[PDB]
Amino acid sequence: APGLVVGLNKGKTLTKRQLPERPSRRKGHLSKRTAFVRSIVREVAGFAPYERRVMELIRNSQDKRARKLAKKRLGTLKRAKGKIEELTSVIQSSRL
Amino acid sequence: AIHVKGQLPNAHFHKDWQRYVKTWFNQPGRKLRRRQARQTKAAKIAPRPVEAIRPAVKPPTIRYNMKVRAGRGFTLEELKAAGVSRRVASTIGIPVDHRRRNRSEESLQRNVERIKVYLAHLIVFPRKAGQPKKGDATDVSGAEQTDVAAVLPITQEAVEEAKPITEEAKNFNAFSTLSNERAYARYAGARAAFQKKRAEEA
Amino acid sequence: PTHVSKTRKLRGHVSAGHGRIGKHRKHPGGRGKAGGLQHLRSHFDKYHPGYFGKVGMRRFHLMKNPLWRPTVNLDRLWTLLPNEARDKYLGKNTEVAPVINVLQSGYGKVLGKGRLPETPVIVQTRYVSRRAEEKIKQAGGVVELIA
RNA sequence: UUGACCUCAAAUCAGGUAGGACUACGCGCUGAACUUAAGCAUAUCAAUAAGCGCAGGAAAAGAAAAUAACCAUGAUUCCCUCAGUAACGGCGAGUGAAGCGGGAAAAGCUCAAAUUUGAAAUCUGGCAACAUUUCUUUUGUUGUCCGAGUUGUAAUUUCAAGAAGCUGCUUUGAGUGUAGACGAUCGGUCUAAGUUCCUUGGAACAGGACGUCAGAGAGGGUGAGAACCCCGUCUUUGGUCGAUUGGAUAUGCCAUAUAAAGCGCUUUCGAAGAGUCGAGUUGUUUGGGAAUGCAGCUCUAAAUGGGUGGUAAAUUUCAUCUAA
RNA sequence: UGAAAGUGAAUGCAGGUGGGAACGCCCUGGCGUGCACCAUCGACCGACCCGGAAGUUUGUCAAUGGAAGGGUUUGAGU
RNA sequence: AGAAGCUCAGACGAGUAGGCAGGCGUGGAGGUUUGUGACGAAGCCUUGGGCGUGAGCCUGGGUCGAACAGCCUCUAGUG
């Protein structure tokens, strides 16, 4: 396959280089100050009404219903699942 | 209402196209204007060449990856290898392409020797006359306006001439290998699923 | 020009060669390809079959470059070489076999139509036909895949 | 009670700015119908005309929330090509792009998010001094008061990084004349040779003899076809003399590197834009077809998160890029 | 050539046959010879309908792959 | 024997719509003609002459006063 147009590792083999990491790709990495500030703001502000509703559903253990409500509120199931795991972490930490 | 031989008409002329007809009667005039502007730039910019050096890059498709063309600028990795800082490269006429990268050592070397040839043949005037600093030339009497293409052209890879036939090339079914690799790539996804389903089943 | 045309020979003739019984009217049969199933069906069926309806599946965002694959036959492989290389290698027994990179000639596949001389030859290509390879190996040469 | 501050007012207060015209070409908004489909309602005409708003000498666009799937390319614009193609269409009439590739031209960058904190280091204005000028018409400098500003003005940073550190080489003015040279520049000027004879005629600029000039035999004017009568034409990308400008050069003076900067290694750290993204929906648009863009409404994120990879969904990888 | 995935044009002197331009030989014909064009019989390439030999690795028992060979089907082919 | 020429013979000849061919005329462009013209160009008038089947063309006389034409090609706002 290497050097055969078709296959899995198709294409010309010309050594290899390790590209330097671009600073733009670091975006999305959670910073120390950003984590500190967001914790302060969460304490100051609280949760949105739909976040509260989801947390109650997670407490009462309707995981599917909480997932479907979060998808309804946020729009995509991926963002819903991220919010569920975010809110269940809040629940676990508060029980701690 | 269409009764003659030939293909069915396809003239996209149902708008107000005469309003937007573009004529080329100014083609000789524009050509002379571009010539005069080019000569005005040549005289105004001093000894410095009218065209900056460009890297040698490969076009990004199977239709064109066998050729070498001119790129936009030299990557930061290439400039570091050639020993030129990005701050001075723009000042001495070396373009900088922060977006490009060297995924292969071959592309890296290709442009590094291009910068090395440019640096060897470059006469840099001292900023203050008579006080040559680092990189500044000692004599600038022979400075001239030359063509970067003549000093350093874009070179195309040339296929090697006749080479001997070896036995591992003799025992190589090219068509069967092409068919096998295509089929291997086609069904690699199904194989990964089957190996998975086998694991949980086991 | 204009002086060797008609309307210089119909000057004087009434109706200008379009007849009296029917005349030259603006669009007596409709504009453009109007019809094809109603009153132009006779011309459309007998001279342009297959014009109406869909056949096949659509491809969205088709790009020609990944499909680029011009083909060359065996009977042109030696003409792809310079004249000096043909003189040096065609018909002469040498330890070193001439090589043709058809990709640099502008070809993505080597097809098998035609005959190939008996001298060994190295063919560098991306794709090749089954019997195109059979004739190249028959001629004593080899095919090397390029990518 | 006086005060401080906030908010909101007034003045023919001090100093400014806006409109209108123009609109060939620029950016938007708004927006048809005739027409075509041999009828006609989707469509087409057309994202056009009319209407409305706002610019410039160009405008707009622009340094990738871009392509691609390559051995990878690399801001934008325009040309050729892609291509009458992929695609959209009562799949009818019709409509219809983009990546690549070749060329023209090329140029890169600036903030927000950082404690200067051993020092608001920042700036408008009043006043007074000087200086400067396409210019008594222009444009600044320095000092000193009043204010603005900590609800954040400078310095430093922009992801291509950077920031703090770690030695160590390297680099350095936002200056002012004056002199002459070398270029450019509107403009005042300068410019070769028959008007000799004969004939015709009202007129010779015609015809014929004899010449002349030509780097000037372009073109006009002059009482009829004039290189030599006149203006011009050629020389001229030039002599000329009168002001302008340009980049160098000679030095003169002022300049606190007590600074600043590039580069190199960090066991490190690295702040990155929200009623915005995204989703649904309704319009309107597109070649975009299971929504291409835009807009309205509803819901509303996130932190290796968010975009995008042109068939919708869940899931898992991979590239790429880094919006608001 | 097919909607695509894809595959992709010499059994032969690049075949036979019929008529054929021009030429040659013989005594008007005959004999060769046959360009160009049609009629026709094949061969080859792609689809279509069978047939699954190797071979590739992954499931070897298989997965994948497609050879020979057959249809008298088809193409805007050689 | 402007071989694109010359020469011989035979048959034949209606025509709307329509097709084709060869010609005549007009404005402008290139070439050409030692081309015509104030001793009268162009235009115009004509019970003058001449040529061609024809489209047309030439010419005498009259008027007139500043330009115009033949041939080979190019072209079109060409009858």
UniProtKB/Swiss-Prot annotation, chain A:
Principal location class: cytoplasm
GO annotation terms (biological process): cytoplasmic translation
Further remarks about this protein from its record: There are 2 genes for eL36 in S.pombe.
GO molecular function: structural constituent of ribosome
Subcellular location: Cytoplasm
PANTHER family: 60S RIBOSOMAL PROTEIN L36
Listed InterPro entries: Ribosomal_eL36, Ribosomal_eL36_sf
Quaternary structure, from the entry: Component of the large ribosomal subunit (LSU). Mature yeast ribosomes consist of a small (40S) and a large (60S) subunit. The 40S small subunit contains 1 molecule of ribosomal RNA (18S rRNA) and at least 33 different proteins. The large 60S subunit contains 3 rRNA molecules (25S, 5.8S and 5S rRNA) and at least 46 different proteins.
UniProt function note: Component of the ribosome, a large ribonucleoprotein complex responsible for the synthesis of proteins in the cell. The small ribosomal subunit (SSU) binds messenger RNAs (mRNAs) and translates the encoded message by selecting cognate aminoacyl-transfer RNA (tRNA) molecules. The large subunit (LSU) contains the ribosomal catalytic site termed the peptidyl transferase center (PTC), which catalyzes the formation of peptide bonds, thereby polymerizing the amino acids delivered by tRNAs into a polypeptide chain.
Protein name listed in UniProt: Large ribosomal subunit protein eL36B
Organism of derivation: Schizosaccharomyces pombe (strain 972 / ATCC 24843)
Region feature (Disordered): 1-31
GO cellular component, one term: preribosome
Keywords, sorted A to Z: Cytoplasm, Ribonucleoprotein, Ribosomal protein
Family as reported in the entry's similarity comment: Belongs to the eukaryotic ribosomal protein eL36 family.
UniProtKB/Swiss-Prot annotation, chain B:
One CC-aspect GO term: preribosome
Gene Ontology molecular functions: RNA binding; structural constituent of ribosome
Nucleotide-binding as UniProt keyword: no
Biological process annotations from GO: cytoplasmic translation
PROSITE patterns in alphabetical order: RIBOSOMAL_L13E
Pfam families for this protein: Ribosomal_L13e
InterPro entries: Ribosomal_eL13, Ribosomal_eL13_CS
Disulfide bonds listed in the record: none
Modified residues (Phosphoserine): 176, 179
Subunit structure: Component of the large ribosomal subunit (LSU). Mature yeast ribosomes consist of a small (40S) and a large (60S) subunit. The 40S small subunit contains 1 molecule of ribosomal RNA (18S rRNA) and at least 33 different proteins. The large 60S subunit contains 3 rRNA molecules (25S, 5.8S and 5S rRNA) and at least 46 different proteins.
Family statement drawn from the similarity comment of this UniProt entry: Belongs to the eukaryotic ribosomal protein eL13 family.
HAMAP family reported in the protein's UniProt record: Ribosomal_eL13 (MF_00499)
Listed name of the protein: Large ribosomal subunit protein eL13
Protein's gene: rpl13
Swiss-Prot record, chain C:
Pfam family, one: Ribosomal_L27A
This protein's record includes keyword Cytoplasm: yes
Keywords from the UniProt entry: Cytoplasm, Ribonucleoprotein, Ribosomal protein
Region (Disordered): 1-35
Subcellular location: Cytoplasm
SUPFAM superfamilies from the UniProt entry: Ribosomal proteins L15p and L18e (SSF52080)
Single biological process term from Gene Ontology: cytoplasmic translation
GO molecular function: structural constituent of ribosome
Signal peptide (UniProt feature, chain positions): none
GO annotations of cellular component type: cytosolic large ribosomal subunit; preribosome
Biased composition (Basic residues): 1-12, 20-30
InterPro entries registered for this protein in UniProt: Ribosomal_uL15, Ribosomal_uL15/eL18, Ribosomal_uL15/eL18_sf, Ribosomal_uL15_CS
Domain of life: Eukaryota
Keyword Cell inner membrane: no
Protein task: Component of the ribosome, a large ribonucleoprotein complex responsible for the synthesis of proteins in the cell. The small ribosomal subunit (SSU) binds messenger RNAs (mRNAs) and translates the encoded message by selecting cognate aminoacyl-transfer RNA (tRNA) molecules. The large subunit (LSU) contains the ribosomal catalytic site termed the peptidyl transferase center (PTC), which catalyzes the formation of peptide bonds, thereby polymerizing the amino acids delivered by tRNAs into a polypeptide chain.
Quaternary assembly: Component of the large ribosomal subunit (LSU). Mature yeast ribosomes consist of a small (40S) and a large (60S) subunit. The 40S small subunit contains 1 molecule of ribosomal RNA (18S rRNA) and at least 33 different proteins. The large 60S subunit contains 3 rRNA molecules (25S, 5.8S and 5S rRNA) and at least 46 different proteins.
Family note: Belongs to the universal ribosomal protein uL15 family.
Note: There are 2 genes for uL15 in S.pombe.
Protein name: Large ribosomal subunit protein uL15A
Provenance organism: Schizosaccharomyces pombe (strain 972 / ATCC 24843)
